[PDB]
Design a protein around this ligand. Structure first.
Ligand SMILES: NC(=O)C1=CN([C@@H]2O[C@H](COP(=O)(O)OP(=O)(O)OC[C@H]3O[C@@H](n4cnc5c(N)ncnc54)[C@H](OP(=O)(O)O)[C@@H]3O)[C@@H](O)[C@H]2O)C=CC1
Ligand SMILES: NC(=O)C1=CN([C@@H]2O[C@H](COP(=O)(O)OP(=O)(O)OC[C@H]3O[C@@H](n4cnc5c(N)ncnc54)[C@H](OP(=O)(O)O)[C@@H]3O)[C@@H](O)[C@H]2O)C=CC1
Ligand SMILES: O=CN(O)CCCP(=O)(O)O
Lengths: 379, 379
């Protein structure tokens, strides 16, 4: 049948790619709701005009002032749209901790949640896990999509290890000394039209991978000491599962987020023609190498935060957003990003308590930002 | 819940590894029968003592006499052992088309046929398929084990291509001129697997991969034009499935037959500790290259034979067996193996008819052997 899809964060990278998948597959999907922040209001309005979807939300009231016919506007507009729209699938492609309430609202409706928003799991943690029922959350991230597919190769009891792949970033194989003179521009900070500056940076520092490791644990229920990371520079293998007999199952495709997006939308049904397959007509190789955890401890710190539990992973992530932005502003060096994350985490044991509300999560993040700010400033 | 296993070809490469898996897993498996040719009585008597199984078949009459009190002896011994032994699993690890009657007898008992002896399925074709219920034949070779595991990654309608990997043999990358000089000693070594003499030779000539393409079509029902072959020198990836959305799912492990053996014996349940997993704490690469079909046409010839159908795959295999014997005896050169296969197949018009009985298959093989000898006589 046809799936009714609410797209939250419709004007972003994931949201617009999802809309292309949906436009290409009118037999499988219909859009029944769109939500955006308001900074790309003009795009949202064009999306209404193109799709005919009038069921739209804009977070920014100023932005909403410019139109006069937005059904949902202002604070919690996305949450209100979710609560009042009948849908089969909610795609949460919101950015930041503001994706958390809409995730909670979506889960309550009993719709499938195609989840891109990282903070929903990294920060929301047990709050989101307790609200979700088995199979309700389908991950959009290419690594987690890869794992979901590879886990089909046996029962849950047959899993030995989850193995995530990492590109290694621009500083792959760089020594600690090399890393000292890393500049913002080198860390991939360009004024790129779609990609945020934090995405290349988080990939470069291996924090993105630390975040994906935390989400892997929460999504798939595998202990942190059984979640490995291997460096794979080609980014063709998106992740692997190693089973108790010694068999490894791997997912492979040329990079293209439309593959994992399409499958998260249509889960468990694959979407024909979503992306190009690996081609074996020309000679190639898939390389693997270990990560030097002494030079790149971001993944180890993510495991420490995840093992501690509660709001510790919210602290990990909020510490990074602060430390990473400080690096981008010249206020710290590159190696100091993960150094600050570790310093903030070491002081954060009060946040190991489980969050009862969204407000507990925000408080932890608030504390973590302030703590990182003091570490950056010297105060 | 212990599975009773009859092991045919117990003294060989697969047979001994299978006994090792069973010895390591008395919880899951018991040996209840052993069959061998009689050329290695040392090993067989050792196996009798260690397993405590006296229910034994020896093909060679003189060899069985030397031992004394062997219950089944002569060329029908393995077949009669199967017909008269109660078991849950028959592991057919015999070599050559001589495994046909034990394969048919095994299937007739209703036991699972764990098939190492792909030649009997290649030879039997639809005759063997009509004898089996769905899922009764469970492949032991790494390729089809990999395919079966990877096919769990989607539903049947989602399968676009099956991708078999080939090591390429010791002569991977060699020219046709280079191949002229190949000796049985050179062809008797394999870069990645340790196997019996016939599979070692067939891997050097690429006839093994040709036989596996036919096996894939017969076991999985996939058309010949959707079965790809790619050369992978490391033999770590054992085969892959490409799905309609562009996703590829692959199975990988250090070459060790104990892995696919364990899974075939216990299907669908994986056997804990069977084999070592891929190790990602040290650098490695998985390489792919196309097969040079001009230098190695054995897979294309297998395709032509498979497409023709009926008794034509029995002809392909039987031609190979004769040519291979002539190469190993010093009568013909290495390139003449696939040359003779081509010459015999292209004279084999009458053999596209579907076998109604075993005798149809026997007739096709008899014709093919005679025709192969004529080709040998001509050089
Ligand atoms: N991009 C990728 O390739 C990948 C992304 N992810 C994760 O998926 C999530 C989204 O990715 P991405 O599409 O790149 O993010 P983007 O920045 O590209 O798009 C974010 C979307 O959120 C909207 N938004 C911001 N604030 C609000 C609000 N208060 N209410 C409603 N909507 C709002 C924005 O609207 P507006 O534009 O008008 O401000 C925009 O449409 C992130 O958490 C990211 O970590 C995971 C794997 C890879
Ligand atoms: N070896 C491997 O790693 C792999 C094997 N295969 C397949 O498995 C099958 C066997 O492999 P492999 O172990 O190497 O073969 P082997 O040469 O190592 O052993 C063959 C076995 O069959 C027995 N045998 C030979 N002739 C007769 C006969 N006339 N009657 C009854 N039994 C007989 C032999 O007993 P004896 O010699 O003591 O008289 C021996 O135990 C092949 O079809 C091959 O294609 C598939 C994938 C990989
Ligand atoms: O399981 C192991 N094999 O089937 C051996 C494959 C050898 P080849 O790829 O060279 O045919």
């Amino acid at each position: 049948g046809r799936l009714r899809v609410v797209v939250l964060g419709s004007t972003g990278s994931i949201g617009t790619q999802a809309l292309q998948v949906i436009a290409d597959n009118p037999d499988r999907f219909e859009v029944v709701g769109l939500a955006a922040g308001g900074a790309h209001l003009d795009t949202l309005l064009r999306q209404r005009a193109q799709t005919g979807v009038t069921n739209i939300a804009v977070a920014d009231e100023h932005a909403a002032q410019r139109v006069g016919d937005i059904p949902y506007h202002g604070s919690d507009a996305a949450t209100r749209l979710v609560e009042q729209t009948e849908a089969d699938v909610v795609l949460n492609a919101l950015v930041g901790a503001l994706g958390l309430r809409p995730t909670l609202a979506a889960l309550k409706t009993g719709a499938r949640l195609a989840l891109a928003n990282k903070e929903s799991l990294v920060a929301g943690g047990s709050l989101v896990l307790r609200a979700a029922r088995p199979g309700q959350i389908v991950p959009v991230d290419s690594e987690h999509s890869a794992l979901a597919q590879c886990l089909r190769g046996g029962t849950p009891d047959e899993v030995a290890k989850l193995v995530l792949t990492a590109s290694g970033g621009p500083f792959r194989g760089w020594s600690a000394a090399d890393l000292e003179h890393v500049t913002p521009e080198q860390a991939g900070a360009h004024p790129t039209w779609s990609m945020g500056p934090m995405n290349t940076l988080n990939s470069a520092s291996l924090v993105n991978k630390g975040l994906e490791v935390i989400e892997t644990h929460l999504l798939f229920g595998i202990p942190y000491d059984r979640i490995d990371v291997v460096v794979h520079p080609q980014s063709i293998i998106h992740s692997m599962v190693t089973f108790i007999d010694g068999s490894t199952i791997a997912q492979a495709s040329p990079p293209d987020m439309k593959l994992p997006i399409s499958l998260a939308l249509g889960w468990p049904r694959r979407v024909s023609g979503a992306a190009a397959a690996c081609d074996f007509h020309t000679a190639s190789s898939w390389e693997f190498e270990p990560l030097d955890t002494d030079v790149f401890p971001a993944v180890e710190l993510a495991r420490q935060a995840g093992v501690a539990g509660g709001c510790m992973t919210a602290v990990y992530n909020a510490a990074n957003e602060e430390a990473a932005a400080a690096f981008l502003a010249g206020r710290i060096g590159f190696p100091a990003i993960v150094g600050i994350i570790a310093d903030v985490l070491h002081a954060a044991d009060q946040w190991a308590v489980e969050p009862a509300t969204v407000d507990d999560v925000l408080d932890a993040q608030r504390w973590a930002r302030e703590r990182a700010q003091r570490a950056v400033s010297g105060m």
